[PDB]
């Protein structure tokens, strides 16, 4: 039920190309992870807004920063084998990170864990990182959260943290105003 006008009024810095890639696909995975109400729909909306840089970006641009050199050989991302930490960087529109949840996202999203750990380029695709977000946000119970309205809790859940919060709470606002 939302418009491309709509998503643009949010994502003020959208190209026209994202908003026409990135709406269908959005009405379509929302309404199936039951991102359905104004409420549910507004917080999900100015989270993916600021995680993708406005659908600027559905893959990690890699350095490899200090940071990201630290991504090979960690077990809690379950990258046990060499040259991982590259190949499962982020990826999604709320990027997904390391081996190991490539594969929990791929058995979601088609059946078998093996399809992105074969091809990790599936995750930057329009369907997947459109779908692996709304997968991401209904398997983490942010759909009850943001029926408490509970946007911090939200961040913390996406992010790890509060990082960006100013950035999430502006797309926020306009939602709010845009779509209720
Ligand atoms: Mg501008
Ligand atoms: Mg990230």
């Given at each position: ?78 990258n046990l084998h060499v040259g991982d930490?590259?190949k ?11 081996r ?81």
């Amino acid at each position: 039920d939302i418009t491309n006008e709509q998503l643009a009024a949010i994502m003020t810095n959208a190209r026209k190309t994202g908003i026409d890639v990135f709406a269908p696909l959005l009405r379509k995975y929302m309404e199936q992870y039951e991102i359905n109400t104004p409420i549910r729909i507004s917080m999900f909306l100015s989270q993916i807004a600021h995680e993708s840089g406005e659908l600027r970006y559905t893959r990690e641009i890699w350095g490899p920063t200090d940071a990201q050199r630290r991504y090979e050989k960690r077990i809690d991302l379950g990258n046990l084998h060499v040259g991982d930490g590259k190949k499962f960087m982020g990826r999604g529109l709320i990027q997904i990170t390391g081996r190991a949840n490539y594969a929990a996202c791929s058995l979601a999203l088609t059946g078998s864990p093996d399809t992105f750990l074969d091809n990790p380029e599936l995750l930057s695709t329009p369907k997947y990182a459109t779908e692996s977000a709304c997968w991401f946000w209904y398997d983490r119970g942010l759909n009850e959260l943001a029926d408490s309205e509970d946007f911090q809790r939200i961040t913390k859940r996406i992010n790890g943290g509060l990082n960006g919060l100013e950035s999430r709470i502006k797309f926020f606002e306009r939602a709010k105003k845009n779509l209720a």
